[PDB]
Design a protein around this ligand. Structure first.
Ligand SMILES: *Cc1c(COP(=O)(O)O)cnc(C)c1O
Ligand SMILES: *Cc1c(COP(=O)(O)O)cnc(C)c1O
Ligand SMILES: [Zn+2]
Ligand SMILES: [Zn+2]
Lengths: 422, 133, 421, 136
């Protein structure tokens, strides 16, 4: 009676109950939160364990023998293990960071400082990359002398199998391949196996920020060399991200940041480094964030991650279908099974800012409006546009606590903006 | 609410769109307001502002504010244009300002109750400011 | 009680804000004296973060919907609170993940910007924490600048004379990066003397230990940069602050690149946002910033001046009682520059054993080891009159601590001297 | 007296001097990493083929790391490198809370309770993880 093939009405109702923000009203209308691709809402039971930790079991970690230091170090190392188990990795391959953005910057610098990414080598990324997986490579190419090349996208922003094989032909042996696991604009889940086997000798990095929150990722079976994501897009706390790297590669890397915890021996003239993974965590980490990320993983697992994945699939399809029925909307991305999570679109005659504004103020609906931290992809979309393209986009994106009813409200709102609003 | 008749009218106004070929000053506005684009084109003669044109995609608040800013500075001087923008800025940041200098830039007053639309209003002015060193 | 600063009732309300203090270890109340590593958290501040996370949370700056607006306002207001706390302009306050990151930011960006080049010297001190030592030393290999040290005496003290004599050998260091207060010796450093002696250098202060208990006015001190960490001042983990003079910040290459810090991006080129956003790459620790703001409000409502005095009073008491022990070696200045903490060793007992018993049998929490200052340990070694274990125990006080806490420490140490006799 | 971790066995072996020193002209010398917060062990071996004749050590340490070291030495004197690296693995296994062989360990079993102190395990293992690296 809530129109899920995945969850029964009771268990679904228990899930929405975990998210107190869903009880906010904006001018009389309940919150319809469709901005999950920027960040997600937080689960009460997960936040309460985080606050329990801060107030009762908190202290700095690793380098003391007292009761609270012991408890916190254990909690923190178990969070590392939960994240490891979540990706099918070993815990010495899991590195906590401040977020996706940091993880990528970590990798450009460290790969260059370690002599893996040498001057004149090529880094291959796609045209649909988020600024986090573009701006570092572009800018630092100028300090370390490597080159940046692009797997091109089509008019709707799609990355086709043919574009990938075509780029193999022009650029057969890129030292590094850095690719999104799923675009935050087009919703396209990238064909990572095809990319891995096509560039079998590249150091392959996957930006998993949109992918990890709703789809099982097994880092061994994908055989990615590096994978990054952010806790805040998977119900988790802010300030916390993850960098998986293969043990054999991580062993070869110059640390990115230096300081306490990550050293072994320090003299005035010399430094040596700690073992993995501590070598890559300089200074006090986001201790409570990592612990919270662990409890967040536990929460999702208590629901069943396969159910979350199927529920988001089912919402994704529905959103796509309803958006496609509208004659006054231009939609971006593939119209196929690779499209998940989010739909970017424009309303004919109306700037995204006004679309998103009116959806919030008049219908309580939350959506992003703008570049979505992908300026260069905006120019690719502009060339395929059949309207007066504003160099930006509206974006609605779904997650666990959303419903088909959420999406129908989006639809009502957009028809209202179309009809009125000269 | 935020979308008065005054604002919608000025968003639609077409009198100031364009390039000025061989303009004295071309100032591209910065991405300080997502994909609201304003590139201002100026003609001068000393301190007077004879003409001003602008190009760019933008939301109704940004387009209106640009067209209104342009109306109120055409034929007016560089020096007074900068105090007019300080007062347009002060109006939004909840400060003292007074109406006198602004004239009908006062109709954008309610925009301040929408903290995320403030950028849309200010973009043109912030770009007028950088353009007038 | 036994405070010249807080009445019995006022102090008692303060202690009850920290639930951690209600915990017991083998029958004894927690005596938390490891504040120099991190501090316990206040219930009111955490409840406010909970509320934020659960009812006002979204990502910031780039959206127009209700929650994005509340969260963006909250975040920027937190920046303003930190600015007012340091007497800086808000555009001069960058949020980071910690002091450590802030220092790495500076080394990398000062080198990438051309300020810290092959032929240039960074002057730091022998008492520096690894976070203000290891980046300079390691990155010297990659960028070719020199590292020089202001020297400490047998007890770890940086004297005025040492500072002036270094000025004779090292007249024009391009960068000076010094701690505002040592996390091992407790020495509050003479920042004003440092600033005037090296008037032409870019001056960085590692304020991680100083800012939590002494008001810092960055304009009056005239530092070029200051860093500190929220978790040392009752705040959330994963959040730090870098302050920089506006005119210097404007000239710096960003350290980290990504969303938010850009202005224009194409496939081939990139331009940068304005201060401070230019130095905040990607989604920051939003909730951390907001909680650091609520933390500062909490401290200001107690009165930061009272915090500073209460810490002074406890330190003087700690120092007095530890100096009366015939079986202990104390490091550091043992004068009015000595604050917050005492490093020491028990004659013939290794620091791990001292801290273990202190914890297990007295509920007293302390650190034991190098305290992230390994090279300082060799300096203290040369001045040791005992058999020096290349480590020390460290006890450190803060707001919610009392003289009775220090007394339990003293008792513990007497028990420990007998145990290994 | 009454105690918690500092058992009568641990206190006795912490005070042992028998193995304190270096060997002049040594067939092996391995310095321990500082993964134990300023406990130090440097091990000096004499071998005589594939067996182990004499061991000695220096370093400032902990009651627990010192005791662990003394007992480690006393049980690998007169044993093969593999008749020692397997104690090591059991020693480690005990400490990390995994199954292990009681008889291989002999009186090392007296360190069992130390498994209950997450932050003191490093102190126990230091000499063992150093002996591991010293023999590969
Ligand atoms: C949101 C996002 C990022 C940035 O993550 P931060 O937490 O902001 O560092 C990077 N890549 C993709 C694909 C994203 O969707
Ligand atoms: C704690 C501390 C640091 C490092 O703090 P993190 O939060 O671990 O980055 C640096 N310097 C001093 C003096 C400190 O006390
Ligand atoms: Zn706008
Ligand atoms: Zn030890």
């Amino acid at each position: 009676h809530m129109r899920s093939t995945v969850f029964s009405d009771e268990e679904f109702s228990n899930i929405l109950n975990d998210f107190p923000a869903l009880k906010r009203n904006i001018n009389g209308k309940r919150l319809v939160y469709l901005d999950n691709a920027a960040s997600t809402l937080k689960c009460k039971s997960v936040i309460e364990k985080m606050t329990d930790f801060y107030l009762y079991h908190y202290s700095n970690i690793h380098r003391a023998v007292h009761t609270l230091a012991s408890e916190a170090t254990v909690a923190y190392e178990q969070a590392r293990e939960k994240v490891a188990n979540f990706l099918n990795a070993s815990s010495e391959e899991i590195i906590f960071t401040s977020g996706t953005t940091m993880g990528i910057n970590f990798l450009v610098n460290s790969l260059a400082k370690s002599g893996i990414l040498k001057t004149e080598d090529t880094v291959l990324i796609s045209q649909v990359e988020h600024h986090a997986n573009l701006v570092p490579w572009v800018r630092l190419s100028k300090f370390y002398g490597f080159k940046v090349a692009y797997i091109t996208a089509d008019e709707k922003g799609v990355i086709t199998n043919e574009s990938i094989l075509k780029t193999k032909e022009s650029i057969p042996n890129p030292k590094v391949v850095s690719i999104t696991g799923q675009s935050n604009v087009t919703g396209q889940e990238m064909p990572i196996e095809l990319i891995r086997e096509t560039f079998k000798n590249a150091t392959l990095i996957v930006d998993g920020a949109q992918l990890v929150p709703h789809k099982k990722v097994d880092v061994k079976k994908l055989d990615v060399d590096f994978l990054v994501f952010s806790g805040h897009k998977i119900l988790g706390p802010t300030g916390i991200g993850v960098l998986y790297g293969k043990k054999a590669l991580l062993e070869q890397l110059e640390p990115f940041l230096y300081g306490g915890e990550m050293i072994d021996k320090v003299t005035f003239e010399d430094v040596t480094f700690n073992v993995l993974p501590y070598r890559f965590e300089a200074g006090t980490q986001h201790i409570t964030g990592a612990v919270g990320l662990g409890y967040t993983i536990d929460y999702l697992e208590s629901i069943g991650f396969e159910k979350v994945e199927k529920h988001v699939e089912e919402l994704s399809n529905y959103l796509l279908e309803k958006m496609m029925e509208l004659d006054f909307v231009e939609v971006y991305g593939p119209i196929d099974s690779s499209h998940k999570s989010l739909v970017s679109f424009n309303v004919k005659g109306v700037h995204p800012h006004d679309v998103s504004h009116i959806l919030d103020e008049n219908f309580g609906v939350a959506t992003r409006s703008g570049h979505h931290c992908a300026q260069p992809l905006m120019g690719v979309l502009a060339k395929g546009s059949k309207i007066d393209f504003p160099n930006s986009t509206v974006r609605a994106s779904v997650y666990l606590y959303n419903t088909k009813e959420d999406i129908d409200v989006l639809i009502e709102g957009l028809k209202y903006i179309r009809r009125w609003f000269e | 609410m935020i979308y008065s008749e005054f604002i919608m009218d000025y968003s639609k106004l077409k009198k100031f769109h364009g390039k000025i070929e061989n303009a004295h000053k071309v100032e591209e506005g910065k991405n300080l307001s997502c994909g609201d684009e304003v590139t201002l084109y100026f003609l001068f003669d000393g301190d007077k502002i004879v003409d001003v044109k602008f190009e760019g995609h933008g939301c109704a608040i940004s387009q209106a504010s640009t067209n209104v800013m342009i109306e109120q500075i055409i034929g007016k001087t560089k020096q007074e244009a900068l105090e007019m923008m300080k007062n347009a800025e002060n109006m939004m940041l909840g400060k003292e300002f007074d109406e006198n200098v602004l004239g009908p830039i006062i109709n954008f007053y309610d925009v301040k109750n929408y903290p995320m639309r403030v950028k849309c209003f200010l973009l043109p002015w912030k770009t007028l400011e950088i353009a007038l060193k």
